Structures are given as structure tokens and as C-alpha cells.
Amino acid sequence: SDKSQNVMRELRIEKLVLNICVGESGDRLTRAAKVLEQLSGQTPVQSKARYTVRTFGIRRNEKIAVHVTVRGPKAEEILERGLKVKEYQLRSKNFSATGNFGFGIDEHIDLGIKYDPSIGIYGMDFYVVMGRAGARVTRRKRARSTIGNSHKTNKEDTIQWFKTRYDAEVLD
Amino acid sequence: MQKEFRTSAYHSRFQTPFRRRQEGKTDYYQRKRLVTQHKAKYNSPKYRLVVRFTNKDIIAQIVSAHITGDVVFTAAYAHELPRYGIKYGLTNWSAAYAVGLLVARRALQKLGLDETYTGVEEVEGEFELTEAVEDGPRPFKVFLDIGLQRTTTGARVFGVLKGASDGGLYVPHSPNRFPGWDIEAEELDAELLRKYIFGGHVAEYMEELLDDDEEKYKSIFKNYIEEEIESEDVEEIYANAHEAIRADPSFKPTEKKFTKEQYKAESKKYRQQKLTRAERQAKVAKKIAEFK
Amino acid sequence: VIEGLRRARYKFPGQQKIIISKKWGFTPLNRDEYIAKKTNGEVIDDGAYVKFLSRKGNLEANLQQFPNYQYS
Amino acid sequence: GKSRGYRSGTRYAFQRDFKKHGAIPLSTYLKVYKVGDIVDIKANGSIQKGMPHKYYHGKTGIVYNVTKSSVGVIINKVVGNRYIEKRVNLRVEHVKHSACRQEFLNRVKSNAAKKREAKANGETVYLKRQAAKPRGSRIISTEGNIPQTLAPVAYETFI
RNA sequence: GAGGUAAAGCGAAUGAUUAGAAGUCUUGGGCUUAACUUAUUCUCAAACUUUAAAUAUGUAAGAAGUCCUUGUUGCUUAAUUGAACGUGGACAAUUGAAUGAAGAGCUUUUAGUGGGCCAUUUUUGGUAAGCAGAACUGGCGAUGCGGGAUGA
RNA sequence: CCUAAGGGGGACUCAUGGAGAACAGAAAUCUCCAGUAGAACAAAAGGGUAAAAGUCCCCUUGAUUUUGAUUUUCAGUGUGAA
């Protein structure tokens, strides 16, 4: 057909990733891991500092952050809670050149999560990865290749899709 | 601000990989260890069982390597299996077993080692290698070659392996990647493996899906419904198929609906022929004229 | 300039010659060749130096870069 | 102090060819060597096992032994006032057949065939090769080829 | 077959290096000043290089060979496949390039010597040296004779 | 100097740059893209290496036993190493 109206070009979420970088370990990291597990229904993974920095108080190869990747319907559910906190309002700068975007949330209990003294309050980063069907050709082991220029995501299409599909405004 | 990367020097000094490596089809490290023969076994070839899976087919070729290219000894495909009584699930684990059995029987018949090394006739799922007969030819030895496919316990490539081994070929292997192997108590549950050989896993799914989600069962198992094949009828399908393969494993090629010249003439209607020198030069002269 | 170079020669050991070149300035073209390339629209200025027309590469960029080029 | 280690002086000799790094093509491993074959020795710098010493790089010798992954090759080495027979064990990556021998065996076959043809015909042919002889007499026509006179040219500068 | 010196190259990688110009200012100064990017421009490398000689260097040019048949084995092959060494048969002075060959092969035993030096060319240190240190060949030493008046 | 920095298998891809995400900035962690190696490989320098020889995971002790053959230095002795 050679047409951009084709149904294998429909944009859709590949994955939302949930980052909580606290600058230390022990209690705060455990509590952030717990808030990610509650929110996402999954066990997260902790990340380590790639080198000691004294200005940050951070120390090389030490557990600092925590994140979790969610893909599927639960990804769009967590995204829609996040945008209701953001009030369906984003900026142009939030969108990467490739056609991804994200934002941040300063408190998880704002996402419909009951406060617990055992967890406290934690900020959170969102990042949604956009894609189209056929992304496997760059992921699979055998015969791995690249994506055609038209099939690539970009800032323009991702913004248009976002505004149309969420009934939201993007501020230049 | 940052130097542009794709320069002419970068391209000039670029060394391209082997053609079949840049297509992501050949692991040359593995191929080297698979192919190279003991130099004191001078022209004696090493034979590989090439097992490849597509989205719709299973490819099993017995291959030997040569300077001008690999030479196929025998080949078997899963799309041959309708002739033996298997129509659906042509990428089953069980179709993999059947194709391994087919390629084994076909090779042994081409070699004249049919009655010697008849393999495992009563299939029970046990682990077993083909042993050599006394005062006889040694078994045909082949080495499993799975390409870029990952070694996981339960994978279909080892189903083709199991079929080929039970078919009479001597294929060295350990049982710890078959469906049925338990890594804690390192032994093989021969019942689970023999269930996998006869489509028992698909039969169980048929029964449970019929009893739990009838509409999904209707969509997934449409071909079994239209042929009126219940979950009770699968094991006889695979057993009859094994008997049919053992009775007549000779290769039968599709009777070609068109000869080579018809296929060629009908495909040449669709190949953009390149331009000539004069045509490209005239295009340049015109594109200059429009720029004036 | 000949006298200026004549004076500089005495500052060097050994022998040196003062030669008048046939070429246009510091270009590798003879004066007539340079005038022909200039009047044919095949040279543009680049500060103290020039750039010459290429009949290789992308034709659109060549035509834009030398707009006064007389294709022959 | 001086330095005379095993691979000293091999900076360029053991380098891979430009844009010829990486994996060895499998034709290297599919060749068959027999006792009596004549082989050229060339070290591959990416195969550190079974390497020749730098002395044998670029030398040609006879195969005398065949093992799993290597051949034994006989090389004559000038040591003082005589040759010493050397025996070097080389993995096949460092070895290649010599092409002059294949040419010579072809000539053996051709000589036999020509001799048989002459014997069936009833005559004798000459099988020895000959060096290039002086040319014989000839006549050159001047049709459309009148001799054209050349002269030395005057000196010109172009600077 | 092998090689990376001579030469060459640097709008080719590494490193060095003169000059403008067009952009970028989102990046730091005072229309600039430097930086950055792009296309250019002058000049270089014993311990840089895509390329790459000449001289020098490895190997072969058959009888211990070639072809046909099929013997041995505990090695090798799925094998009746090979591998190595063979029986029997055939191929004869062009037995498989040139030129030469006071013949070829083999052994024992023992002297002196283990300060060198010179010339052409290549070449290192040094301002240089009838200086000091290497490479190949020829010499002197060990050698008179004709020439260079005289002179290793 | 190293029980792994030795052996085997597997999965992955490095320097760097660009564009994005609460606190967060030149430097924290998260995302995608480009990336012929511009990284890494105990230690000098040269050579070698990209579905690896690099990074990470799993299992290990062939860094074992017997005594011959060979290469370099070379007298074709010894030692060292291979």
C-alpha cells in the first residue's frame, strides 16, 4: 500500500519506567523500593553509583536508586494517574527527539496511595517509551536490523498522538 | 558544536563483517568449533544436524562443510508432515520430534543402515544414545547445530534432537535440556518427556481451555474442531505419524505446477531493470537544464 | 618584491634563486587557466583563497554553490 | 641493555592486514595437509597458539607430521657453515599450501599425456622446457604506418 | 612465497603545524575576542601511516617419479572411507629448464688464532677528527711486481 | 601481582556524543538514538581481540599425573620460557 495510514503504524506505549533516586541506602532505599512495589505490583531493582562523588555524598558502587519497568495495560493506568496529578498538562521540552517523554511526581500518595508511616513520602520520575509494531526487529537475537525512516518515532508524531489521545495540552 | 561523525575517512577505514554475520544468521565462533576436523582424519567430514525454526516451518538438514560451500546430505521439513498424518501445530515440540525422526530415518535409508540401527521403536521418553552393534558399521554420527537459538530446557531444537536420536542416528547429548529434567534431583521424568513427544501438553491445553474458556478455545483450536479431533485423539495422531514415517521415509518432492521457465518469465515482469550510462547522463543533463 | 627577496637571500646559508611563477597568485593554475575558470563561473572566493568546481558528487549542491557556472 | 626476547622485532611482520582483522575464514580450517606437502609459513598474529618463530615467517617447507590441529614442518636453517634441519609445530592458521607445486604436478600430467599421444602417433616429442630464444627474421609493412620522425625536445620550466 | 626500508602521504587514522572564510552564539568575553562546527589553506615524523619499490631472501623444476590393480594395520571413517608402507603391470635415453663440475660421499686427528686495520656504498654518537661504533663486499695484515715522485 | 586476574559455558557490548525525566545542578540514577573500538584486557611497550580475548552470570581446579619430541637464546651445552 505504501501508506502512512496503515494499522501497523499505530503509536503505542512500549514501557513506562519508574525512577526513585535517593542519595543513600538503608531505610530510605528500602522504603522507596516498597513504594514502587505497592504502586507497580512488581519487585523493583536497585541501582549503584558508578563512581564516588563527595559533593553528592555518594559512594562508588553503592545502592542509591530504585526503578521498575511496567508495560501493558498497567503501564497506561499508572500513566493516566500520573497525568491526572499533572492535570493533563505538559510542555514541549518534555518530549525527546526520538519521540519519548516523561515527567515527575513529588508525592506518591497523590497517586491514590494511602499514607503509611512505614513508607513516608517519595517523589517519582515517569518516562514512557513510545513505539510501533515491528520494534522486535531491533531487539531479537537473530537477523537483528534497524527501523525504516518512516516507521521511526519522532517528537512531532508523539506530541500529536499525546494531545489527540489524552485530550491534553502541550505548552511550547 | 560536536564533530559530525559519519565522515569519508570513517567509511574508508571501516571493515565490514562477514556477510552472513552482518545479516545476523551465522555464528562463526560456534561454526568454527562445529566444523573443524582433526587433521589426521584427513578428508573425513564432520556432519551437522542443522535445526532451524521459522514462524511456520521446521528445517532439519544433515550438512557437511566444504571449501566451495556446505553440501546437504538429507533434509526434512515440517511442511512434509501432512503426508504422514500431522496437519496442525507444525511448530509443536511434537512436530519437532517427528521431523527429527523423519530426517534420521531418511538419512539411514540413504546410507543403507535401515535394519541395522532401527533406533528406539517403543517410545517411552527415556534418555538413550544409539549404541554400536557388534562386528558392524558404527552408527551414523551427527552433531547438533542450533545456530543463534538459546539453550533452554524445554526448547524445541532438542525435540528435533530427541527424534533424530530415537531414529537411529548417534547424536551425543545429555538429558538435562529435555522437558522433564529437574535440576534439584538431577534425573529425567521420562513420563513428562513422553507426554511432550505425543502432544500431551497441547492435549491438556485443549481440554482445560474447552472446560474453562470455550470462546478462546473456539478461536485457538479451530482446525481441530473442524476436523473433529478431541484432546483424546492427539496421541494416536502422533503414534500413527511415527509408524508412517518409519514405514516410508523416502523424500517426495512437490509435483511442480509450473516448470522453471514459467516461474522465471512470470517473475521477470516485476524486476526494475537498471538504467544505462546514457540514460543516467541524460538525466543529469536535464536536471542541469531545469536548474538552467 | 624582487629586491625585498634579494635582501632576504643574504640571511640564508648557501645559494637560493628568485623565480617568477607563471601561475595566478598562490593557486596551482596558470594565469590563463585561472582567467578561463573565473570567467566560466567555476571559482568562488573563500577569504584569501578560492574553491573550484567539482563535476563529482551531488549535482544540486554543485549547482547551488557555483550559481554562475556555465555548464558546457 | 639489549633485548632479544622471543617476538622482538615483530611489530609489523605479525600485524594483520589492513581491514583484515577479526575472525579467520573457515577455508583455513578445511584444508587437508599430508606428509610430504609443501607449505608456506605465515604467522597470524590473532592466533597466539602454535605460532612460528619470526625466523620461519615467510619460509617454505615439507610437512612431516599431522596432529589434531597442527602440522609438523621441516625447514633448513643456515647455522654457520652448514644447514640444520629444523622441525617446527604449527597450527594450521599459520600454514598454507604452496602453489608452485600444483603447477609442477600439472606439468607432470601434461608431459605424460603428450608422450602418450606421440607414442600412439608413432613419434617422439620433446618434454624439456626452453628459455626464451632470440626472435627470428620478419618483414614489417608500412601501410598506414609510415615511420614518424621524433626529435629531442627543448628544455622548458613549468614553475 | 615472504618483507614495511627508499620513495610517497597527510582536503587518509595517530601525533605536529600557518592562515583566512562561512556558520554557531544554545558558550564564555569585550561590531568584535577566543573558542566550537563545516568546506578550505602552508608545512612535517627514527620510536606515524593507507600505498610501496630496487638490492637482498624461502621453496620447486620427477625414477626415492607418474598412472592402473589391490595387500598390510591394533591407526582412521557411517562405511567397502582414509592414512602410511607395499606386491603385480606399464611408461627408457628429452628421466621432464640453463651453465659449470681436477669427481662424489665419509671419518679421524691435530697446529696457529681468539688486539685488527683500510676503501666504495648504507649507517649511529659527536661541531668535528688520521675520532668512536655497526652492515655487505673487496683488500692490507700475510704481497712482491708496473703506475700514483714519495706512501700498508 | 592473581583461587581468579586460572579453565569451561552462557548472555551482553565498550569510549564518547546528542536528545529527554521531581529534588538533580558540569558530575547521582532512569530513557532512546548514534557509536570500527575513538574503551577494556594486573603491571613497560608493541602486537592481538566485538554475537570476544572486553563486562556480567553459572559451574569448576588441566595452576593435576608419567615420561619422551620440538622452538628461541645456542656449542645447536646448560638455565629461563614456549
Added chain:
RNA sequence: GGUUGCGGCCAUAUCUAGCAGAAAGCACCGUUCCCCGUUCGAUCAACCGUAGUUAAGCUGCUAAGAGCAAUACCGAGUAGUGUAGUGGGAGACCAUACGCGAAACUAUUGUGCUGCAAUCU
């Protein structure tokens, strides 16, 4: 002629930017009971071939395209170099005799070929 599996040589095959592609094949593509692996069925595993799509992969074509490869009354018998002389020149160096002989440059051409097996409007 198309395509697939396994290849040989390993850019005439690579790279950028467009476009086109019937049949089959390949592919993307659907699902998670089972073997299996994940922070995540994304990759890996398994099941269906059933609901779809040539959009992407893949193949071909286009570009005074980059790169690569090849050629030459291109440069140049130049640079360099073996041998020779009681040759020239204060010397650095140069010519001649008998030989060998580059690279850059310039211009033009090309842009995978192919083995085994299977299959196809």
C-alpha cells in the same frame, strides 16, 4: 527469475537519502495452561497459524551520492634504486652506460559473484 535454510570468497556486498515489491517464502503479528527466563512473556521459553499487515525487517531500483573495486599514450619512465668509470662538480650534488621501477595526482568504468538443498503465479 523470486524466496528460504546452510554456506564460500568476505564492501563491486558497506553507508546515507528517496521509491517500488505479484506468487510463494520470510517477517511483523495473536496468546500465556504447559517446559523455561525475566524488575517487566520487552528479550528468552512455550502455544495457536487461529484475528490482522506489507508499515517495518527483507529484496530490488534511483543519486554529475560518500566509501569501496578496477582500468590507463594520467602523472611518469618521474621519485627511488642494482651495477660502472683515474665521469662532471670546492662541496652539497648531477649526468652518462647496462638494468629495475613507485606512490600521490588525473580521467574513465563498475557497485556482489557464487555452491548445496527445498520451494514458487
Added chain:
RNA sequence: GCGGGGUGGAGCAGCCUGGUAGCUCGUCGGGCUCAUAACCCGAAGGUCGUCGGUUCAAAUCCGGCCCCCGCAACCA
């Protein structure tokens, strides 16, 4: 050719054997005194000569360079 030194305003530690710059005096603020000194309570002040390198980490370990003070320079 060597050897030591280079750290708050001054004179010195810390080096060695990497993870914190310590001492006395001085400077500044307040107090006591009619005032000053002494005395009392407080506070600042050395990115370690400099350019690099290694190290997860440099005053420290590893080179070049700069300044200061010294030792050796013999047989005729």
C-alpha cells in the same frame, strides 16, 4: 653530578605506611582596665611550589618544570 626544603600572615608538624590538614605565635570580635600590656571567652585564616599521571580516593604515591639552601669536583 648529587642532596635536602616548597603546607594559614611567621616559624614548624602531617608524607613515610593514601580516606581527617595538627602546634606555637600572630590577625579579627567581645570582656577586664581610666587606658595600654598581660589575662579571660570566641571567630576566621593553608585547595599543600606548579603542570601532568595513576589510583574508587593524592599534601601524601609516580615523572617534567620553577624557586631556595647546601655537598663532591681527585692523580699528575
